[PDB]
A paper describes a structure:
The RNA recognition motif (RRM) binds to nucleic acids as well as proteins. Here we describe the mode of interaction between [name] L and LL with the methyltransferase [name]. We demonstrate that for the interaction to occur, a leucine pair within a highly conserved stretch of [name] insert their side chains in hydrophobic pockets formed by [name] L [name]. Notably, the [name] binding region in [name] is distinct from its RNA-binding interface.
[name] LL has a very similar amino acid sequence with 68% sequence identity and domain organization to its paralog [name] L. Immunoblotting of the purified complexes with anti-[name] and anti-HA antibodies demonstrated that similar to [name] L, the [name] of [name] LL interacts with [name]. The ITC result showed that [name] LL binds to SETD22167–2192 with a mean KD value of 8.27 ± 0.28 μM, which is slightly weaker than that of [name] L (higher KD value suggests lower binding affinity). In the sequence alignment of [name] of [name] L vs. LL, we noted that the residues belonging to the [name] binding surface are highly conserved, except that I214 of [name] L corresponds to a Val in [name] LL. Next, we generated a [name] LLV188I mutant and performed ITC and found that it shows nearly the same binding affinity with SETD22167–2192 as that of [name] L. We next tried to crystallize the [name] LL [name]–SETD22167–2192 complex but did not succeed. However, we got a high-resolution structure when a truncated peptide encompassing the core interacting motif of [name] 2180SNPNAGKVLLPTP2192 was used for crystallization. We determined the structure in the P1 space group at a 1.60 Å resolution, with two almost similar [name] LL [name]-SETD22180–2192 complexes in each crystallographic asymmetric unit. [name] LL-SETD22180–2192 structure shows high similarity to the structure of [name] L- SETD22167-2192complex (RMSD = 0.672 Å over 92 aligned Cα atoms). Similar results were observed when the binding of [name] LL [name] with SETD22180–2192 was tested and found to be weaker as compared to binding with SETD22167–2192.
Residue numbers in the entry:
A (entry chain A): 164 to 264
B (entry chain C): 2182 to 2193
Write the structure that this text describes.
């Protein structure tokens, strides 16, 4: 179901996957509000965008792309949660409306 | 797969 939260699966994650990397990946194509990175079906992340349109733009532009040449291939689907909540801003979760510390 | 071969960032 279309939604403003995307679920990213990072195939062949040869390099670190942190919120700063995913912000530089996603935000130029769709405005990001929150990012949560976790391990489940491999290295995965949910990214909450400002709107459904912004999430659709990010999904269209990034699905199947590699973050870095030859690795870190993105598989993107709509996430189940309609919103994300970030406990703290660190390397694995970030709310871009709120300060570090 | 229209983004096959797309690369987003310089390698670290």
């Amino acid at each position: 179901h279309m939604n403003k939260v995307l679920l990213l699966s990072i195939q062949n994650p040869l390099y670190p996957i942190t919120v700063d990397v995913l912000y530089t990946v996603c935000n130029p194509v769709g405005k990001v509000q929150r990012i949560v990175i976790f391990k489940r079906n491999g290295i995965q992340a949910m990214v909450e965008f400002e709107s459904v349109l912004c999430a659709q733009k990010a999904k269209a532009a990034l699905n199947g792309a590699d973050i870095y040449a030859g690795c870190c291939t993105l598989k993107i689907e709509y996430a189940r949660p309609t919103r994300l909540n970030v406990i703290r801003n660190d390397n694995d979760s970030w709310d871009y409306t709120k300060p570090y510390l | 797969n229209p983004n096959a071969g797309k690369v987003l960032l310089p390698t670290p």
